[PDB]
Design a protein around this ligand. Sequence first.
Ligand SMILES: Nc1nc2ccccc2nc1N1CCCC1
Length: 370
Amino acid sequence: GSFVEMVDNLRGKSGQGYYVEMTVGSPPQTLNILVDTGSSNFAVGAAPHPFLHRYYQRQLSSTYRDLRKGVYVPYTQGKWEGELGTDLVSIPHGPNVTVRANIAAITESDKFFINGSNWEGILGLAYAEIARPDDSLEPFFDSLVKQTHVPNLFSLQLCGAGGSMIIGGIDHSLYTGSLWYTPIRREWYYEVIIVRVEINGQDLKMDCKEYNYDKSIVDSGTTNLRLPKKVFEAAVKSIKAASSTEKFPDGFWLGEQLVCWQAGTTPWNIFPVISLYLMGEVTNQSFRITILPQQYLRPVEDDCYKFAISQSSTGTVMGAVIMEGFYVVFDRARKRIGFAVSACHVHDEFRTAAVEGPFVTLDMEDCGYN
Ligand SMILES: Nc1nc2ccccc2nc1N1CCCC1
């Protein structure tokens, strides 16, 4: 399992996602595409926009095809809108293959393209269920798999402060220890089940349904770890108490105010370690993943930091803060998500992120909410 073409094929600014090189059309038109496992449309900019600079030019592709059908994607704090079509796609530092796929050519934007982000489009890598306009618009990865011999599998190493996407394979060099897998509960988002939460080993002692209310997803297109209101409050209460030797304003905890120490003097060790126990492959087994303050304290330009754990009303989003500690294998073929300690993860001399198991956990499928 060696994939040296694909290693280090991701780049990205802090809090502005991780993107990848893709070409579309004939002749090839290069674009930087956000890697988003929380959506299922491959959409790209196809018109002028201030924060864009390059874009898809459909009238220059001899292989473009118009599906003569619009698509409208509203969401939490914005919208994008565009015209459906198809065209040959490739990934220069990906599998050596060209495939025809659904492309959404974006024409209206609103709080979507981010200034100085250097990505021009989005590659939704999750399931048809949540594709727009409807689940019959085949997402790119499916197309890729069905048109080639590429296994139904991708893995993501994301490094805090670049990273790798391996399509079709697990690269052992990107991580150490063992891979541990958790079931994909249902195939829309990469939904999975959390059965226990610990701050420095203290249980939140919470009815585990609260952890997945009304779902727990793995989303590379979300920066923060987002937790359900109820879980969030208890988590911050516990993190507060554990780092209480130094105190911060309410505003820091709400993800607003930065906090700064002199360069190189960051007291990582006063902040607690956060562990999520995920449902295992075998009955009555969980494994845990364990992330550091280095993961949930996001650097900003003294060394300055922004708290990267926020409230949610739509359930647990396991974002980049979580993904940055782990090689995360997206094993669609066997319906499961594999975690291993990332070889590229940020940590101090004294504490590392971790992936340990097994643990005896009874009644784990009570931990999902319906
Ligand atoms: N993963 C997400 N992708 C998006 C793409 C476009 C617009 C909004 C998006 N929101 C996402 N999140 C997953 C659940 C809520 C946030």
